[PDB]
Design a protein around this ligand. Structure first.
Ligand SMILES: CCCCCCCC/C=C\CCCCCCCC(=O)OC[C@H](CO)OC(=O)CCCCCCCCCCCCCCC
Ligand SMILES: CCCCCCCC/C=C/CCCCCCCC(=O)OC[C@H](O)CO
Ligand SMILES: CCCCCCCC/C=C\CCCCCCCC(=O)OC[C@H](O)CO
Ligand SMILES: CCCCCCCC/C=C\CCCCCCCC(=O)OC[C@H](O)CO
Lengths: 143, 132
C-alpha cells in the first residue's frame, strides 16, 4: 500500500465518475453511485498494489488505456449519441479492461481478482451498446 | 526499447484523439492534427521510456490521471459547454500533466523534455477556459 499511489489512482477515476455524474445513464437511486464507488475503489486498490511491483510497466500502460476509453465511452454513447463510434470505443475499452485484469493477474492475483467485477460492467456496457447499435445502424446520424 | 509499451501508450491516446475528431476545435487545417499527432507520439515515447525503469509507479499513476482528464476536458468544454465544470476539469488536468512531467524528469531527463510541449498545450487549454 502507498497513499500517494492510491490517492493518485482514485483521483484519476474522477474523470469517468464526472462523465457519469453529468450524463446520468440510463431500482433505488443509491445503487448506481454505490456500484461505481465500489468499482473505483477496487480498481485504485489493484493499481496501487501493482504499481509497486517490478515489471509492472505494461500492466500500468494497459491501465491508463482502459481508463481513458472508459472516460471516452460515456459521452460518446450517452452524450453525442453516436452509436457506431461508441461501439468501437467500448470494444477497445473492453479489450484494455481485460488486458489490465490479465496483466494484473500475472503480477498479483489480488489485483486481478479486484478487476473481475469491472470486466463484468465492461461486458454489460458492450452488450447494451451492441444493440443500441443495429437498431440505429441505418441512421448515419446515429453512426 | 519496447513496441508493446509504446504501441499500448499511443493506442491510449486514441481516446482523447477521438474526442477531438468528434468535437472539432475550432490557420492551415493540417496544423491541428499535426500538432496533436506530434503531442501523442512525444508523450508515448516518454511514457515508454519511464515504464521500463524501476520506481516508475507514481509517474505512471500520474500519466493515467492526466490522460483521463485530457479525455474528459474536451467533451465537457466543447460538448456539454459547461464552462465552470470544465474549469475544474482543466485545472485538475493541468495539474496532473505538470506532475507527470516532473515525475518523468526524476527518472529520465528525456521523458521530461518530451512532456514540455504538452504542458504548454495544457496551459493554453487552461487559458482558453478562463475567459469562457
Ligand atoms: C466488496 C467491495 C467491492 C466488491 C463488490 C462488487 C462491486 C459491484 C459492481 C459490479 C459491476 C457491475 C455493476 C455496473 C453498474 C454501473 C452502471 C452503468 O454505468 O451503466 C451501465 C448499466 C447501468 O446503466 O450497468 C449495469 O449493468 C446495471 C447497474
Ligand atoms: C488478443 C486478441 C483479440 C483481439 C481481437 C478481438 C477484439 C477484442 C474485443 C472483444 C469484444 C468482446 C465482447 C465483450 C462482451 C460482450 C458483451 C455481451 O455480449 O453480453 C452483454 C449482453 O447485453 C448480455 O445481455
Ligand atoms: C476530487 C478528488 C477526490 C478523490 C476521489 C475520487 C472521486 C472519484 C472516484 C469515485 C467516487 C465517485 C463515485 C460516485 C459515482 C460516480 C458515477 C459514475 O461513475 O458514473 C459512471 C460512468 O458513467 C461510467 O463511465
Ligand atoms: C497500435 C494502435 C494505435 C492505433 C493508432 C491510434 C493513435 C491515435 C493517436 C494519434 C493519432 C493522431 C490524431 C491527430 C489528430 C487528433 C485531433 C485531436 O486529438 O483533438 C485534440 C483533442 O480534442 C484534445 O484532447
Amino acid at each position: 500500500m502507498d497513499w500517494a499511489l492510491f490517492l493518485t489512482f482514485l483521483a484519476a477515476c474522477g474523470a469517468p465518475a464526472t462523465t457519469g455524474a453529468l450524463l446520468k445513464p440510463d431500482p433505488p437511486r443509491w445503487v448506481f453511485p454505490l456500484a461505481w464507488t465500489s468499482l473505483y475503489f477496487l480498481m485504485s486498490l489493484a493499481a496501487m498494489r501493482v504499481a509497486q511491483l517490478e515489471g509492472s510497466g505494461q500492466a500500468l500502460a494497459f491501465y491508463a488505456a482502459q481508463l481513458a476509453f472508459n472516460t471516452l465511452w460515456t459521452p460518446v454513447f450517452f452524450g453525442m449519441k453516436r452509436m457506431a463510434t461508441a461501439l468501437a470505443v467500448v470494444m477497445v475499452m473492453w479489450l484494455f479492461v481485460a488486458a489490465t485484469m490479465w496483466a494484473f493477474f500475472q503480477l498479483d492475483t489480488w489485483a486481478g481478482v479486484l478487476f473481475v467485477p469491472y470486466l463484468i460492467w465492461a461486458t454489460a456496457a458492450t452488450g447494451l451498446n451492441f444493440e443500441a447499435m443495429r437498431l440505429n445502424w441505418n441512421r448515419p446520424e446515429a453512426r
